[PDB]
Design a protein around this ligand. Sequence first.
Ligand SMILES: CCCCCCCC/C=C\CCCCCCCC(=O)OC[C@H](O)CO
Ligand SMILES: CCCCCCCC/C=C\CCCCCCCC(=O)OC[C@H](O)CO
Ligand SMILES: *C\C=C(C)/C=C/C=C(C)/C=C/C1=C(C)CCCC1(C)C
Ligand SMILES: CCCCCCCC/C=C\CCCCCCCC(=O)O
Ligand SMILES: CCCCCCCC/C=C\CCCCCCCC(=O)O
Ligand SMILES: CCCCCCCC/C=C\CCCCCCCC(=O)O
Ligand SMILES: [Cl-]
Length: 265
Amino acid sequence: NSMKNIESLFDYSAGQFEFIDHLLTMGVGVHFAALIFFLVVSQFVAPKYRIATALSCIVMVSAGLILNSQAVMWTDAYAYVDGSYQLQDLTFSNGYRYVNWMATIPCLLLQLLIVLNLKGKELFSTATWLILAAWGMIITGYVGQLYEVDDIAQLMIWGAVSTAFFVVMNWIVGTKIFKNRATMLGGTDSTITKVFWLMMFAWTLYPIAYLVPAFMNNADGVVLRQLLFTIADISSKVIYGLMITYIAIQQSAAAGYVPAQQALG
Ligand SMILES: CCCCCCCC/C=C\CCCCCCCC(=O)OC[C@H](O)CO
Ligand SMILES: CCCCCCCC/C=C\CCCCCCCC(=O)OC[C@H](O)CO
Ligand SMILES: *C\C=C(C)/C=C/C=C(C)/C=C/C1=C(C)CCCC1(C)C
Ligand SMILES: CCCCCCCC/C=C\CCCCCCCC(=O)O
Ligand SMILES: CCCCCCCC/C=C\CCCCCCCC(=O)O
Ligand SMILES: CCCCCCCC/C=C\CCCCCCCC(=O)O
Ligand SMILES: [Cl-]
């Protein structure tokens, strides 16, 4: 997993290396700061939607820990020798991000179905096919990135299969959204449409980072990839969670829940 990724192939100047480390540690503070927000505001959510904010708290920490682990692993592996940071130990890899995706993605999707006001049979059903679709996407994508150094052909083929799941996944998401927004309260039938387009954008940065080894196989591609993941993380997890929370609170007010009615006031 360490020799299979392109990061183990290049030396990095002090600028490139300190910039990556600063990206990873910044994502930590952003997520753990967001955690405190999602934690505090969960009281302003009616019980019907409160799980939606608790799932954001889980994502914030699941991502913050992996990011924090990525930073420490980033430093342990490289040592400044003769004007450039050089690989010293095989401990860094992007594979740990994919494991973070197996957990955060089901949490990001489940809280979307909760603000849409699904329940019972359809919730457990729609939730089962989206996760198995996301898992199939994450796994096929994990196998392909194991060849981002040896077999680029395999990366493409596995990337194609992973994209097949991605398309099917979003098709189910969009279908459920536009077939259930009329049920949403407080005027959130418009906000949920915006969250969807936020989804379609942020989630599409990952496959672009997945392909950086194919069109920019250099140290500046390693920096571009992490910069892409950083933009994607902050949008698919933080901003996405803020919109989900705003929707959760808004409907809580419309339903007559006072802590949300006084919070928005
Ligand atoms: C040889 C390797 C095997 C190739 C196979 C891997 C490719 C999978 C892609 C599409 C089919 C799977 C998706 C089919 C989804 C049908 C179920 C569904 O979508 O229903 C959900 C519903 O909208 C909510 O209740
Ligand atoms: C490896 C490449 C394989 C080929 C893949 C490339 C082709 C992509 C085509 C469509 C994307 C669909 C994205 C999902 C967009 C949301 C669709 C939706 O919301 O559902 C329709 C709705 O019911 C209407 O009102
Ligand atoms: C941290 C949050 C999320 C939603 C991570 C999401 C990742 C993806 C949607 C990755 C998608 C890929 C596809 C479409 C095909 C190439 C390989 C990937 C797994 C990177
Ligand atoms: C309520 C407080 C909100 C902010 C959360 C706490 C802020 C923590 C700040 C930095 C993250 C700590 C982990 C980064 C490690 C830095 C050293 C390294 O490069 O590995
Ligand atoms: C591969 C694993 C498939 C998982 C299937 C989906 C499981 C989702 C089950 C529900 C978890 C969230 C429960 C929150 C519901 C809130 C509504 C209520 O309070 O009754
Ligand atoms: C660690 C928990 C794993 C959970 C797996 C359950 C989800 C399975 C979904 C579809 C898997 C499709 C990927 C094909 C596997 C072959 C790739 C390989 O050889 O490693
Ligand atoms: Cl991530």
